[PDB]
Amino acid sequence: QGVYAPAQAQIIHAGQACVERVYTIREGDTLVLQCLVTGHPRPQVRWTKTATSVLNETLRIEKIQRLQGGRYYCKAENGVGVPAIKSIRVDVQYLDEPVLTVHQTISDVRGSFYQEKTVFLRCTVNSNPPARFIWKRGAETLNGVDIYEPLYTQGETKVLKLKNLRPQDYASYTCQVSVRNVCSIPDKSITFQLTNTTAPPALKLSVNETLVVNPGDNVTMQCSLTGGDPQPEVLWSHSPGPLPPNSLVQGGNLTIWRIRVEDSGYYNCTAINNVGNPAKKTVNLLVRSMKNATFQITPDVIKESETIQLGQDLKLSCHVDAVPQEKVVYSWYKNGKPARFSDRLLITRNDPELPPVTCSLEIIDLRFSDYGTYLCVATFQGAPIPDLSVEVNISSETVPPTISVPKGQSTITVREGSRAELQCEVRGKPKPPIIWSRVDKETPMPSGTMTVETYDGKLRLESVSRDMSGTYKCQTARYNGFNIRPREALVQLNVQFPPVVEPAFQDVRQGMGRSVTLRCTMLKGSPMKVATSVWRFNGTLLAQQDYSELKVDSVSRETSGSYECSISNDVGVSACLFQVSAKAYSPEFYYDTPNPTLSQKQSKNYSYILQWTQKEPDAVDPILKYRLEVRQLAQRNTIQTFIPVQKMEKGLLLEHILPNLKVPQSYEVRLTPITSFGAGDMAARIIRYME
Numbered sequence: 001q002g003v004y005a006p007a008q009a010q011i012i013h014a015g016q017a018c019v020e021r022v023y024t025i026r027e028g029d030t031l032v033l034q035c036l037v038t039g040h041p042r043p044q045v046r047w048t049k050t051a052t053s054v055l056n057e058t059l060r061i062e063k064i065q066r067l068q069g070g071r072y073y074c075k076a077e078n079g080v081g082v083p084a085i086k087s088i089r090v091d092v093q094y095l096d097e098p099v100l101t102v103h104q105t106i107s108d109v110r111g112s113f114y115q116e117k118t119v120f121l122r123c124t125v126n127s128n129p130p131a132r133f134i135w136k137r138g139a140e141t142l143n144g145v146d147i148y149e150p151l152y153t154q155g156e157t158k159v160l161k162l163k164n165l166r167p168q169d170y171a172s173y174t175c176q177v178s179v180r181n182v183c184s185i186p187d188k189s190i191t192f193q194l195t196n197t198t199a200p201p202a203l204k205l206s207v208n209e210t211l212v213v214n215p216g217d218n219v220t221m222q223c224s225l226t227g228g229d230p231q232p233e234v235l236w237s238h239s240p241g242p243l244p245p246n247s248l249v250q251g252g253n254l255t256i257w258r259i260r261v262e263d264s265g266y267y268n269c270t271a272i273n274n275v276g277n278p279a280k281k282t283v284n285l286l287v288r289s290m291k292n293a294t295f296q297i298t299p300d301v302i303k304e305s306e307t308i309q310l311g312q313d314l315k316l317s318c319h320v321d322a323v324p325q326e327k328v329v330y331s332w333y334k335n336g337k338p339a340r341f342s343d344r345l346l347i348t349r350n351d352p353e354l355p356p357v358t359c360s361l362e363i364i365d366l367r368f369s370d371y372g373t374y375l376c377v378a379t380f381q382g383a384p385i386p387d388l389s390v391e392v393n394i395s396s397e398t399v400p401p402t403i404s405v406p407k408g409q410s411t412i413t414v415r416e417g418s419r420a421e422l423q424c425e426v427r428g429k430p431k432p433p434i435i436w437s438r439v440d441k442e443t444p445m446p447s448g449t450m451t452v453e454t455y456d457g458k459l460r461l462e463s464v465s466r467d468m469s470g471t472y473k474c475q476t477a478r479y480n481g482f483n484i485r486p487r488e489a490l491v492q493l494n495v496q497f498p499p500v501v502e503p504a505f506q507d508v509r510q511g512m513g514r515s516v517t518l519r520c521t522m523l524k525g526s527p528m529k530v531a532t533s534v535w536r537f538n539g540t541l542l543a544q545q546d547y548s549e550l551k552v553d554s555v556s557r558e559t560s561g562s563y564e565c566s567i568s569n570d571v572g573v574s575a576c577l578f579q580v581s582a583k584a585y586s587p588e589f590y591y592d593t594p595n596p597t598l599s600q601k602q603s604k605n606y607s608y609i610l611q612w613t614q615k616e617p618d619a620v621d622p623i624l625k626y627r628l629e630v631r632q633l634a635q636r637n638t639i640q641t642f643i644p645v646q647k648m649e650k651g652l653l654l655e656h657i658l659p660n661l662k663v664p665q666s667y668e669v670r671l672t673p674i675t676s677f678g679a680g681d682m683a684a685r686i687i688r689y690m691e
């Protein structure tokens with residue numbers, strides 16, 4: 001490629017800037033960067049910040065922000081050689097209003113019981129560039145007292161330390177912070193009234209550390225100041241989440257109406273006045289609830305049993321999830337209630353190694369007299385909430401569980417996106433719930449956690465993703481049944497999905513007598529086999545290995561057009577699209593030359609050196625002639641002429657002088673190649689008098 005030259009970029013600065021390698025502007029202004037490029041063919045330009053991208057030789061950002069600052073890249077490519085890249089660092093600049101805060105420090109003195117008070121005046125401001133701080137008490141401070149930047153701060157903060165605090169120091173101190181007026185940014189000031197009444201905030205709360213309540217109850221909390229100068233600002237907050245709904249803040253008073261169980265949590269009242277540590281009082285609000293009452297049958301452990309056998313230990317545990325967990329109390333009944341007071345032979349244990357906070361009675365030397373219906377009742381002492389119970393019949397019939405997959409739903413295949421339903425079925429007395437997990441990987445579930453409880457033994461997946469395709473485990477719970485090694489069973493999940501073929505579009509060129517073959521290849525797809533391929537031409541079907549091929553015997557006017565191969569797996573369809581013709585490629589205008597020729601500076605005429613190259617001359621039938629059209633933008637009528645080609649090769653520069661052009665005006669130039677097939681791809685350009 002003799003005349004083809006690789007791209008070359010150069011960034012240029014415009015829009016608003018201020019004051020080498022960097023483009024500094026005030027936040028809120030507008031950025032305007034332009035990428036000038038050269039090389040042939042004329043390269044295209046995208047602005048990016050990664051090296052996302054905007055396809056434009058000029059980058060323009062209105063009302064720029066702090067974060068939009070950074071390094072920007074102009075990328076320019078044309079096919080020939082290595083793409084051109086150029087960088088520029090945009091440094092958006094700003095100066096917010098400074099914050100002024102103060103705290104005291106009392107400290108001992110060597111060999112003395114006298115004490116020295118020290119105040120720290122801390123001035124913080126976020127700014128680009130690094131700010132400049134000046135301190136004043138009406139007058140500028142230099143010396144006796146000290147200025148510095150404290151630790152754990154990168155110059156955004158300066159502190160004025162007043163070591164021994166004598167009355168004359170009690171004045172108004174004012175931090176004035178400047179950005180050097182760079183980018184014409186004003187300085188800003190903040191002042192503080194340091195007085196012997198100045199004091200950090202303090203609060204008193206009308207309720208205890210932790211407050212227990214029932215659902216529905218209205219609860220109101222008064223948070224009142226007990227100290228603070230300046231007058232601090234009191235604020236309530238909640239974790240997790242925000243306060244509302246159903247809760248109103250008078251200010252200081254926080255009331256919660258019709259409290260729901262999910263409203264439980266920490267409510268924090270905090271006072272701030274930029275003096276000392278902000279005061280906070282914290283109350284933990286606990287709404288009562290009881291959920292998920294569960295029992296466990298644990299056969300003799302020491303005899304390593306998994307089954308109810310006479311002459312063995314049988315533990316029957318009991319548990320429920322409650323907010324004031326420590327406050328629950330359990331009652332064990334049996335065909336009516338003995339309240340588990342027997343002890344001898346049958347005994348109560350409330351806290352063994354078993355799960356947390358579980359009442360569990362043991363039966364030593366199990367007897368037929370122990371076969372019965374046992375009930376455990378969890379309750380809160382004199383609480384309005386309802387009690388919860390768990391019945392568990394023990395008899396000869398009670399037996400550990402077994403789990404299986406029904407029929408051959410072991411592997412269940414579905415198409416991506418649809419819903420999937422995995423099923424396990426469990427047998428035993430009692431029948432425990434099933435816990436579904438994934439085994440091929442460690443991912444979560446419908447419930448968003450590693451495992452999911454289910455009693456119907458069904459696991460439903462609404463929007464199934466191919467990523468989810470894998471193996472899944474279903475197993476017996478250790479609760480609401482035997483507490484034994486869970487029984488397990490696996491099911492496979494195939495997530496089929498439609499094909500993806502290549503190329504989506506391809507522009508194919510070839511001479512008039514010659515042949516061409518189009519291939520549509522399948523890259524991804526489950527099933528990964530071409531079930532069928534169907535080729536169409538300009539809308540109509542044609543008659544006809546991982547891919548499909550079609551051969552156009554003779555690329556002619558009758559055969560040239562758009563070909564579509566619709567490849568499909570048993571699940572979906574996807575298509576390649578080919579454009580076949582014997583049209584020559586577009587001419588590529590050459591932009592980098594001094595062009596105009598003044599004809600005797602008279603007749604109001606100049607001439608233009610129109611130059612270009614022919615893209616891929618040997619891709620189709622040889623180029624015979626170019627059709628040249630010239631319009632001057634001002635007259636509708638156009639002068640059409642034909643250039644006859646002498647000879648050409650890839651990259652050869654072509655020329656044609658346009659003879660009669662009004663001396664000031666510009667023109668549109670349309671250049672079309674002609675082969676035996678006819679008109680190739682037309683190209684266009686605007687020419688102008690330069691000098």
Ligand SMILES: *[C@@H]1O[C@H](CO)[C@@H](O[C@@H]2O[C@H](CO)[C@@H](O[C@@H]3O[C@H](CO)[C@@H](O)[C@H](O)[C@@H]3O)[C@H](O)[C@H]2NC(C)=O)[C@H](O)[C@H]1NC(C)=O
Nearest residue numbers: 291292293294296319320321355449451453477478479483
């Ligand atoms: C209802 O209550 C029962 C227990 O009373 C809950 O079963 C418990 O579920 C948790 C997981 O949520 C299990 O803890 C986990 O154990 C694995 C190891 O097995 C560990 O890797 C995890 O970090 C986590 O600690 C716990 O073992 C299990 N307890 C029993 C006795 O099986 C059940 O989840 C509750 N259901 C609901 C809907 O609240």
Ligand SMILES: *[C@@H]1O[C@H](CO)[C@@H](O)[C@H](O)[C@H]1NC(C)=O
Nearest residue numbers: 054055056057058059060061
């Ligand atoms: C570049 O962006 C401007 C708007 O900022 C737009 O007017 C112009 O047409 C764009 N350039 C191109 C080549 O589209």
Ligand SMILES: *[C@@H]1O[C@H](CO)[C@@H](O)[C@H](O)[C@H]1NC(C)=O
Nearest residue numbers: 167170171194195196197198
């Ligand atoms: C503080 O200063 C004021 C006058 O500025 C004075 O009335 C007061 O006694 C001083 N001492 C205290 C503890 O406020």
Ligand SMILES: *[C@@H]1O[C@H](CO)[C@@H](O)[C@H](O)[C@H]1NC(C)=O
Nearest residue numbers: 215216217218219256257258
């Ligand atoms: C809380 O107040 C509302 C009316 O403001 C009332 O309907 C509700 O019953 C109150 N809460 C209780 C526990 O009574």
Ligand SMILES: *[C@@H]1O[C@H](CO)[C@@H](O)[C@H](O)[C@H]1NC(C)=O
Nearest residue numbers: 220221222250251252253254
């Ligand atoms: C908060 O409520 C109490 C009475 O419940 C009242 O004395 C106090 O003024 C209230 N505070 C506000 C800011 O309304």
Ligand SMILES: *[C@@H]1O[C@H](CO)[C@@H](O)[C@H](O)[C@H]1NC(C)=O
Nearest residue numbers: 237238239266267268282283
């Ligand atoms: C409220 O205080 C608790 C206890 O100190 C704390 O865990 C929680 O993060 C705090 N929440 C807020 C919003 O301050």
Ligand SMILES: *[C@@H]1O[C@H](CO)[C@@H](O)[C@H](O)[C@H]1NC(C)=O
Nearest residue numbers: 372373390391392393394430
């Ligand atoms: C226990 O057995 C009784 C009668 O034998 C029955 O009414 C009750 O429903 C059974 N309980 C369970 C949990 O099966």
Ligand SMILES: *[C@@H]1O[C@H](CO)[C@@H](O)[C@H](O)[C@H]1NC(C)=O
Nearest residue numbers: 537538557558559560561562
């Ligand atoms: C197919 O359609 C394209 C676009 O309309 C057209 O250029 C071509 O001549 C058509 N081919 C035939 C054989 O009609």
Ligand SMILES: *[C@@H]1O[C@H](CO)[C@@H](O)[C@H](O)[C@H]1NC(C)=O
Nearest residue numbers: 599602603604605660661662
């Ligand atoms: C100047 O241009 C006009 C219009 O294009 C043409 O008629 C005329 O012959 C030209 N004169 C010369 C001296 O080239």
